[PDB]
Every structure is written in structure tokens, then in C-alpha cells.
Design an enzyme around this catalytic site. Structure first.
Site, PDB file in Angstrom:
ATOM      1  CG  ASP A 144      94.884 128.253  36.957  1.00  0.00           C
ATOM      2  OD1 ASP A 144      93.769 128.305  37.217  1.00  0.00           O
ATOM      3  OD2 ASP A 144      95.346 127.052  37.043  1.00  0.00           O
ATOM      4  CG  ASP A 157      89.743 125.093  40.811  1.00  0.00           C
ATOM      5  OD1 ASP A 157      89.162 125.567  40.011  1.00  0.00           O
ATOM      6  OD2 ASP A 157      90.774 123.979  40.291  1.00  0.00           O
ATOM      7  CG  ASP A 183      87.552 130.156  27.554  1.00  0.00           C
ATOM      8  OD1 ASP A 183      88.432 129.634  26.962  1.00  0.00           O
ATOM      9  OD2 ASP A 183      86.379 130.664  27.103  1.00  0.00           O
ATOM     10  CE1 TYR A 219      98.703 123.082  38.938  1.00  0.00           C
ATOM     11  CE2 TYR A 219      98.068 124.393  37.064  1.00  0.00           C
ATOM     12  CZ  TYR A 219      97.875 123.604  38.111  1.00  0.00           C
ATOM     13  OH  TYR A 219      96.308 123.587  38.587  1.00  0.00           O
TER      14      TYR A 219
HETATM   15  C1  LIG Z   1      87.643 120.345  36.778  1.00  0.00           C
HETATM   16  C2  LIG Z   1      87.546 120.746  35.198  1.00  0.00           C
HETATM   17  C3  LIG Z   1      88.650 120.111  34.334  1.00  0.00           C
HETATM   18  C4  LIG Z   1      90.018 120.717  34.836  1.00  0.00           C
HETATM   19  C5  LIG Z   1      89.875 122.225  35.253  1.00  0.00           C
HETATM   20  C6  LIG Z   1      88.768 122.717  35.259  1.00  0.00           C
HETATM   21  C7  LIG Z   1      88.647 124.146  35.695  1.00  0.00           C
HETATM   22  C8  LIG Z   1      89.895 124.772  36.299  1.00  0.00           C
HETATM   23  C9  LIG Z   1      91.120 124.136  36.329  1.00  0.00           C
HETATM   24  C10 LIG Z   1      92.168 124.729  36.842  1.00  0.00           C
HETATM   25  C11 LIG Z   1      93.470 124.151  36.633  1.00  0.00           C
HETATM   26  O1  LIG Z   1      94.717 124.817  36.935  1.00  0.00           O
HETATM   27  C12 LIG Z   1      93.568 122.895  36.104  1.00  0.00           C
HETATM   28  C13 LIG Z   1      92.267 122.201  35.776  1.00  0.00           C
HETATM   29  C14 LIG Z   1      91.042 122.726  35.986  1.00  0.00           C
HETATM   30  C15 LIG Z   1      87.525 122.034  34.836  1.00  0.00           C
HETATM   31  C16 LIG Z   1      85.959 122.544  35.506  1.00  0.00           C
HETATM   32  C17 LIG Z   1      85.246 121.151  35.387  1.00  0.00           C
HETATM   33  C18 LIG Z   1      86.165 120.127  35.018  1.00  0.00           C
HETATM   34  O2  LIG Z   1      85.770 118.913  34.457  1.00  0.00           O
END
Ligand SMILES: C[C@]12CCc3c(ccc4cc(O)ccc34)[C@@H]1CCC2=O
Ligand SMILES: C[C@]12CCc3c(ccc4cc(O)ccc34)[C@@H]1CCC2=O
Ligand SMILES: [Cl-]
Ligand SMILES: [Cl-]
Ligand SMILES: [Mg+2]
Ligand SMILES: [Mg+2]
Lengths: 129, 126
Positions: free
Chosen positions: B101, B38, B98, B14
């Protein structure tokens, strides 16, 4: 405290790992809400309320020979919750070892741990080879 | 449900995918009726097209990198959690973030839930 801010979650979860490290079980147990749950590992049956949670930390820690350190920053939300990467150091089969762990926590509106869920299985245990 | 070793595989697969920007293969790893949170604290996103619009949004510029910053922690009930760092540009500032997940996989091996832990306290200008 009120419900912890993201900064407040970072500090509460970092202190929790020093307590585990220093084995200060009764102080650990004060961080928990009186009616908290501990799922550890996650996937095993939950442990309710402070008496059961103290004995579990007594089981796990009371023998000594366990250091726990963060390996990266606490990740903190805006709804009272945080996640943290750490490593535990102890004894397995008479030789030092290590278990990489992530704990998620949900706090309360009094600033105490309502839940906790500790991720890990044997894939995260490693040894010298 | 998937094994602890296999979860170490699905979750790492992933980040691979996030990292190269393939939105359709990211969306195929999910279930039916998956949910995304998220950040965890915001309502859940659910629908397959919505879960795509979300990855299209974040990712689409081709300029977001993702890498793990430690190992995947996996349980024996098809769940895992992982630490990673995203780097992106945010209106000209080079930044980092940072993240953790947490994911649960159905027996078909697809994401059933994902919950991404982070906040603006997890942001750094590089
Ligand atoms: C969305 C994002 C880029 C990718 C990303 C973010 C935050 C949590 C994530 C969790 C994921 O599993 C995959 C990608 C992201 C960032 C927060 C702001 C931004 O530009
Ligand atoms: C109990 C233990 C030491 C501490 C510890 C373990 C696992 C998860 C933990 C989660 C914590 O939040 C605090 C401590 C532990 C190890 C599993 C085997 C072992 O020796
Ligand atoms: Cl990290
Ligand atoms: Cl780590
Ligand atoms: Mg210490
Ligand atoms: Mg209460």
C-alpha cells in the site's frame, strides 16, 4: 514490448535491482523512457529525462560501495505498474549500513520506465549497534 | 503534515486494525473525500459508506490476517509505503497474498489517498 503484463513488470523491476547492485549505470538509464522522471526520495524535486537521470545514478552509484537486494516479491498491477521492497547496502560514516527502500514504477507502452518514486527517509537507515 | 516517524505509526496502526477486522476504526482513519484504489489499476472508490462497504466486503468474515513483512518506508511529506501479506480462504483454498500500500496523510492525520499494489501474480496457495 508492449505494455508489460504483471509477469512482465515483475521481471523488469527485478532486473532493474541487479543493475543497481552490479552499478551498471548506462544499462539502468536504457531502462528508463527518454523523458522519464525520478522522484528519490520521494518528496524531493523530480529529476526529468535521461541525461539528468544518468548523472543522478552516477552521483548515487559511481563511487561504488553500494549492493541492493530485494527483500520481498515485486507487486505488479494490470496497468503497467509495480512496487517493490528492497534494501540498499553501502557506506555511512566509514561503516557499512543499510537503507530499506520501496520503489513504485509506472511503465510505458514501449516497456520503459516512465516514472519512478523511491520511498524512504532516515527512519529507514540503520547501522550496527 | 504528519512526521516520518509518525507515518511509520499511522500505517502500522492501519495493518493492526486490518488484522483484528475492525472496519469502523479502519474507516475513521480516513479523510473526507479520501480515495481508495485498490487494486491500483481499478477506478477509485470515494465516499465515506462506499469506503466501509469495501472493507465490509473484504473483511467482514472475520477470517482475513494481515501482517507487515518489512518496515514502513516514510517520506517527509506525509507519505509512506509498506509491504504486507494477507492470508484468506478463497473458496476452500488456503491462500496468501502479497501487497504494497502507499498512503498519503492530510495535516489532520487522515488518509487521504491509499493505493494498493497487487495481482493475481501475487497469490499463492499456502
Ligand atoms: C480483499 C482481500 C482481503 C484483504 C485485502 C486484499 C488485498 C489488498 C488489501 C489491502 C489492504 O490495505 C487491506 C486488505 C487487503 C485481499 C484481496 C482479496 C481478498 O480477499
Ligand atoms: C544513493 C544510495 C544508494 C542507492 C540508493 C539509495 C536510495 C534509494 C535507491 C533507490 C533505487 O532504486 C536504487 C538505489 C537507491 C541510497 C541513498 C544513499 C545511498 O548511498
Ligand atoms: Cl514482502
Ligand atoms: Cl522489507
Ligand atoms: Mg547482483
Ligand atoms: Mg514516450
Amino acid at each position: 514490448m508492449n505494455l508489460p503484463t504483471a509477469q512482465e513488470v515483475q521481471g523488469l523491476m527485478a532486473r532493474y535491482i541487479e543493475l543497481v547492485d552490479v552499478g551498471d549505470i548506462e544499462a539502468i538509464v536504457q531502462m528508463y523512457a527518454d523523458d522519464a522522471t525520478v522522484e528519490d526520495p520521494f518528496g524531493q524535486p523530480p529529476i526529468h529525462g535521461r541525461e539528468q537521470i544518468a548523472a543522478f545514478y552516477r552521483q548515487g552509484l559511481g563511487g561504488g560501495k553500494v549492493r541492493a537486494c530485494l527483500t520481498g516479491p515485486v507487486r505488479a498491477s494490470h496497468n503497467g505498474c509495480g512496487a517493490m521492497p528492497f534494501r540498499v547496502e553501502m557506506v555511512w560514516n566509514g561503516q557499512p549500513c543499510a537503507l530499506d527502500v520501496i520503489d513504485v514504477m509506472r511503465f510505458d507502452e514501449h516497456g520503459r520506465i516512465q516514472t519512478m518514486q523511491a520511498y524512504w527517509s532516515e527512519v529507514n537507515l540503520s547501522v550496527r549497534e
